[model samples]
Target chain A: PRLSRIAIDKLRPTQIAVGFREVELKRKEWRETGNHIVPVVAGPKDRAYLIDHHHLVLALSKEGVEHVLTSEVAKFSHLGKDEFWSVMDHRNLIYPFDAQGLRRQSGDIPKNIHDLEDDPFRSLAGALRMAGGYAKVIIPFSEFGWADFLRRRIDRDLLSDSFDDALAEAMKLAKSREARHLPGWCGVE
Target chain B: EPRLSRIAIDKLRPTQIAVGFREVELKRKEWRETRFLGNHIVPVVAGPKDRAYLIDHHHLVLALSKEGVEHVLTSEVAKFSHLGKDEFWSVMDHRNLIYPFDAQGLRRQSGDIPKNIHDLEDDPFRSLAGALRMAGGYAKVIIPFSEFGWADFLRRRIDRDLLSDSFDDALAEAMKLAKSREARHLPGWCGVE
Candidate 1:
């Protein structure tokens, strides 16, 4: 889910100042997580703040915890650290294009998060959403098996059968085994 | 600007007279620190346009139109043609082996790869290895120009299918060919297989 409310607070002149103390705190966090915990600065409305989602994931993974929560953005006073961490667990499952889950979606038709959350399709969407709200979301024509799958829900076809038929034909040309010999492919011969 | 004295003008030949006049017209200057023997001589002249001889190595320096002492140098805006064809032709003939002829040949050879040279030139690295096996070791048989009697050897040659071999494998084959053919020729000019 896209985050709505987030803010960066500079606590003490020492705690979050751009110098030794803050650097030391970040380094300590990195050591504990076993993943590089570097500060990130991002926000739309409020000033940008620092976050290290990878470090948080590492910490949870180390604890044998399957999940943790955390803010999409980490501002110390506002988001509250514990709540932020729980979100992190969910984000970890879906973050960075949820490739593992999407790969599983190739064969397994997922009904919902519970059924296919473990699948790459759902997880990849989750991950893509985490990286940025405007992720590269591709709904493959074959993904739910063309307009029939769409008709089951949306009912009306968004496009004509002729267009769909043409699409299917183009897809057939692409699917030919001989097409594998295109310049990019190293021909078996 | 310093005024030109008649004495300086009278000492020069009609053609040579222009150098002193042009220097005055060009407003050449010597710094306060410069002196007779210590100064460098400069001849500001008119070529097809205005020009100068700041280095003054020519016999014009010994002409004694000016004192033996040096004059500081500078030039005005000038125009001239680029190096003539003779200069470029001499350099092309003497300086480079792949000069002139090879450049034109390669330029002509460039275009959509022909059915024969197409695959190899497409990714030269991969072609070397596969071509090696076909030719019983690497030789110029792959090149289109190679002639086996009247038959153009490369006419019926391997195509892109040959590139399926890994780039590394092709690289190794090319290197082997290069080391073996040291007496024959150099490898690809760019040191890329």
Candidate 2:
């Protein structure tokens, strides 16, 4: 199922590239250690949906890795499709957003991790967070909110044309009052 | 007429002067056109005897100066214009605005720091550490001089020659190291226990 609309968040190429490099270097050890497991929940019709580590799995696949260790988080395989998605959404296990942070139907979620689209703003948010624009929080998928915020303020062309400049601008925006409400906000008040 | 190179860098983060060079070179046209906007303004503190001490933008200033661009704008963050040299340095030290560490991650006297930008040696691993950060190797935290900790960690494990010769190979190794349990001890490390 290589559908591109499964996860609400998009793939950040920069992060995937880094993950790919790490997996490539430690392919042998990684297989032995079996760490970096992807968590999956059994959904309707016996289909397993990944709950986390999608990026890592995608990177592994891109690196020609055919198999990986996966831990089951829950089983809702007996439930109907509607009940399964409802439970997933209630548990915060499903993200029904697209690459642009726009809400979409859960049915639209990508059928496979490979179908995920590249979101440059997600990459910028990752870079900005690393640059200390904000503090790290325990909240899951917090960086996605930052990515969406940046997506609105920054132009796609500028991000594509000059990443460093876009990064500088994102850093500034991350520190501004406009971003104060976002999770993991550590900017000066 | 103080040089940006003469001003002490505030952190021991490894030198990525080449990144700075590329950044400035790319923005040269826009910098000239805008006369350097507020975003480009370097923050400094007025030190003893009216000496200006840069608290940030060491790389940008160095890069701009290397491009023969003079007289950029600055924003004074603090004024210690009345203190003597020793007292000024002491205040800076107290405020964590002074990084008197050498390229080897050894602490040195403030006087031992480079007096000119040209004297600042390049530490290729610092660039690797920075790239690792951008690649989500660590969480962003409020800790100051955190990247220096990453640089020092790599300094002990990685050879300087290998980092300088093949940065990509070194970076691949660095990403692996970054995920290891040992890296958890570094600042802002977010790896699982």
Candidate 3:
């Protein structure tokens, strides 16, 4: 939410799923110095959690940016029953899920931005936004929700086989009853 | 704007018959920006078997598809999937959703419509009509394929060869002719000087 300088290696991820192309897509959005600000949340022992922009940071890390500016949006006391992990969930900050949309242990989240794995469905969902499967909205984690919707309905092989094929199928599915409630829905009034 | 549904570009059924290929080609070149880069979905209606029928954006759709974009996003304007296949075309016609005219500005049977956007025939007059409207020949209208109606009026007056040989030259002739009282019957018609 706000910013300060920190080593890129010191920042931690709050989520587990990100598509590599999605990250690389940002790599192409290349800017001079403006991309340095990243939102972070302070946790126990002075550790910083990346609350958002996991894709941007991952792209920057790969682009050879070693340090970045960090902004603390919130911080957990890490004191009693209030574990840092649960605090993240309660605060609507953490998404400890894998590429398949399955929940993973909090420990499974990457400590280093470079360690983030690719979620192929995530790229499809990202592409879906551009393709107009749904409107771009400010709703929290809506794109992730759309990704899960695709993961459940689309064939994983088809995604790798031909993305357009998966997207065409996904487009039809987007208008179905199941996807009616998604963010930026543009069908049947 | 965020859009709604996506499908193989080839699957969308073209509603109006022809496109201004000049505009289609213009859109194709901008296909360079064809990345998420794209956001607008062509509006559609559901027909038999729930096939998505394109209601508009023929030019952009053709351009996107020709530019190697295999898929595009779209939105449902309505659904006639439950109608008898025979009945569906009637409703589309009644609602002004289907434009069965061909490049020659001649009416075809409702069922004669092309099955895919890529298959749509090109009419130079439609492009001229499209350009005319943008140049204050007329205001864009609510009437579906309103531009085509204007194109039909221009078809016989302008030599087809001249339109293709140098569109701007044809447009100069088109501009002078557009203001005559004869063109007043067309939709989006503005006053004569």
Candidate 4:
């Protein structure tokens, strides 16, 4: 099954480029390794909901890959759609946030990975983290938290109008006291 | 006559080392076809008294050495042959080129920095951090020392035996810790407010 949604703005072009290149150059070898298995969960009607590797799958799809290797991490085929999404939400396996950091209805998530929209702040959060504005921690969806934080402080227009400048501002905020409460902060205590 | 490690400075994670080793094994045919083995040349800097200091690839070099590889291609990024030992290390420190911290994240003296690639120890938390990053627990920050920060934070909370016994369990705890207030000081953190 395709992905439910993608925060396109959060996607890093550089990373996607690398992923595309790796898959293109070593399609056969990657297929053989069994390491590229995308972990998924069985939902209602036996639909496979991807738990991770959304980017790799997306990149592979763009490169004419129709079939992919998948490993089932969980099974909720017995439950109703409502119960399935509830379990997913409880497990933190699903991300329903839009590009603007606004939570969308579970049903609103894109049916296919290709239909995912972009979120520029997600990219900025990634860039700020790379710039050493924060620390790397094991919290799940931690970067999305940073993206949401940035979304609040920086205007969407500024980010769209001047990405580099907005990024510089986000970096400063990433290191500021206001950001100290965030995970992997690494700012001065 | 200092030899360099073939892994990059930012890639000190044990999981990363394992991945590199596995890639080399799996991609042997491709490597041979393209004769691209030399393309992954190790980068080094000529430090005090013409001694070569490896600026990157500390893990891959060790892996290749373990696999009985010798005579690798290296690129010199800087020539500080004129500086004395202390001055050279100082310069390296200033430039963030040297990682003298051990698996425990304790800053070792310049002398304690491993002279041989084989002397490097496996840091379990490094593997955890690597796993965490792959799981989207953290963004792939380009900061050279970012992973080390994660390693150090986990060091204080996680028991080594538990980490070795059940990595998945350790990772679950690490994920909680990553979001906890205690980890607020670490690099690349993006916790909830």
Candidate 5:
């Protein structure tokens, strides 16, 4: 078996959170049997993440695999950290902040989290994290997105040369309904 | 998605523009029956209705194209049914059935890939590279086109004067060059260590 007994701790988790009870149940099932292999996600740089289906097998003792193959699904190494996670969120694997874990299927959660909990507080907290000073979150992802809409209606040179007045008008536009469908917008703040 | 079919020789576009004719001539004399009924399988992508794109075997296709063979067996390893020429080549590029370099071993536009084996050009070093492999200079691997790396190594180091004088002479030097510790960085390098 060209396999390694890779310690679970060494593996990185993609999830922001997981449910504790489900993890305890899997931990108890450690007295059970085995499977041949588990596949992990190849991430940026040299490391890989335990992305999916992995967690069920991840309890290692949950069924005691003989040897695990860290078969990389594919790599997101070409993508920068921001773009990589942006794709992850777009694909719904990432539920950034609020940290209780966003809505995800059983297969979507990362292997590292103990368990995913159900919490409405998570929703309220997540929205707040996304809400005020929204530009902070937007700054983390630095390509034209909300900025893309502004250039269409507002003058390009106006934003370039007289950003003072442009900022005045942009704040005015940012409050309007046109900003709908953009990231983290709640009508009429 | 590999499905069997036969297409006209003229209708086939070679994915690679460069091929060594010495290899082509060898195939010409060694085989006569260019039958595509079951045995002769050439890999291609359906790029255009009139022409399927050939992904590999430039030498074999050119050798048989010289045999006045117009129709041959094909297995479409890829399909470009909905795609036009540009988009089709784009997918082929992603699939890595593309080598845009010409006979002179220079990068060109994807459009520079030849329309048929008839347009195939010879890179003298390309022939030497193949001879290097057959003489066991390096092993073949699925990460195909590693031979091109050997071709580049030989072209830069071994003069064309030796290759033109005799292929055996070139191969003799290439075998030594391949085993040297310096060639370790290349793929298919049977490690000198």
Candidate 6:
């Protein structure tokens, strides 16, 4: 099916549902000089098909010019009849952090805005909220002011590895249990 | 060349990160049927109910790093609630990550969906805000009763519970408000139902 005859309605949920094959990271490019390169396939028709532009950008920026499986190509004459293609907007897109390796990388990221994931200051903002409450609690206990409370509390270690271990254990047990049993049962395997 | 990958684990510093595992304690006889894999299904807490517990360790690790500590020791950083040995080690495998430092606050973490916490000082909220936000769910970002805006949430949404009254009324009101204003369009950060 040459795309010229196909109306937008023919590609209803399927048009939206056509999943692209896995993308490669080594050969993609991010047209840095243009409008941030929201990679969408412009067609002979008015239809614009979206691709993994964000991933392409990140991978290309990091690895340089990678091959990718995207819907952003203008011609599908070479594709098979049932082969996949999609038209998702950037609004529906998720970023590289969703991947396990990418997530790990983001965790190690400092304040490098471009080098890091999208949202950078979220953790610091949460600390500020905690500092505020610590101020309320310790302020009454000691005559020291809010700044003292923040300085004393903000830098303390929040998550203990031991607790994370416990949570992991609980999660494992929860995953393996039988449906008929209660959460408090001893049948965890 | 001080490669971060080759850094000795023993040299890590005292960790400020901590975790607390919470689960609802229910009797074995809680009769319930839940759908499995989209099929109309029947099961108990051990079955599909446990699906909710299928948490990602990386997600939890990010959640627990609330204070943004840089030199945290992973060995001392975690604690479990009432789980036994078998369950504990199971979750530990998938939940590992070592950041050069903590990311930003909950609202700004990459790939996180924002959530609300009623009390900012609450342990669960404090530790898990980033995950909840990353979850992009609707949650009550709780503040301690002593915190500034807690009274505002209390006055408008929180119900005045009596000794014999269930907190359901207040919860319903809060949910209504949360759905309408506070946590609308966010993911849900519900405790045991």
What TM-score goes with each of the models?
0.15, 0.43, 0.49, 0.42, 0.49, 0.20
Candidates in order have lDDT scores of 0.27, 0.62, 0.79, 0.63, 0.62, 0.26
All candidates' chain B TM-scores are 0.22, 0.78, 0.91, 0.75, 0.91, 0.22
Per-candidate clashes, comma-separated: 24, 9, 8, 23, 7, 64
lDDT tens digits, residues A9-43, model 2? Answer: 22211111122222333444445551233456666
Off by over 4 Å in 1: A1-189, B1-82, B86-90, B97-165, B181-193
Interface RMSD in Å per candidate, to 1 decimal? 37.2, 22.3, 14.5, 18.3, 16.8, 21.1
CA-only RMSD, every prediction: 31.8, 20.9, 18.0, 14.6, 15.8, 24.6
On the 0 to 100 scale, the lDDT of residue A168 in model 3 is: 91
Query: How accurate is chain B of model 5, given as a TM-score from 0 to 1?
Result: 0.91
Query: lDDT tens digits, residues B49-102, model 3?
Result: 968888777888888788777886565658788999899888888988888888
CAPRI class assigned to model 6:
incorrect
Instruction: Return the TM-score for candidate 4, rounded to 2 decimals.
Output: 0.42
Among incorrect, acceptable, medium and high, the docking class of model 4 is: incorrect
TM-score of chain B of 2: 0.78
How does residue B90 of candidate 3 score in lDDT? 88
Docking class of 3: incorrect
Give the 10-residue window scoring lowest on summed lDDT in candidate 3 chain B: B33-42
Give the per-residue lDDT digits (tens) of candidate 4, residues B1-193.
Answer: 1122333333322111112222233334444453221244556676665456666665456655555555454555578888877887788888788777766666777777766655666777766776666566666566876766777778888988878788799889888888778777776776785
lDDT of 3 at B125: 90
Candidate 1 residue lDDT tens string, A1-189? 111222112201001101122223334554675111223333223333333333233333334443222223244334543444344334332122231212222123221212212221222222223333222323321221222222232212322324344334333433445435322222233
Expressed as tens digits, the lDDT of each residue in A16-118 for candidate 5 is 4433333444556555522333445556676666654333444553454433434454577788766777776675454433233234443454444344333
lDDT value, residue B76 of candidate 2? 54
Error of 1 at A182 (Å): 65
Clashing pairs in 2: A1-A111, A3-A110, A3-A111, A3-A112, A5-A109, A5-A110, A6-A109, A6-A110, A8-A97
DockQ of each: 0.00, 0.01, 0.02, 0.02, 0.02, 0.02
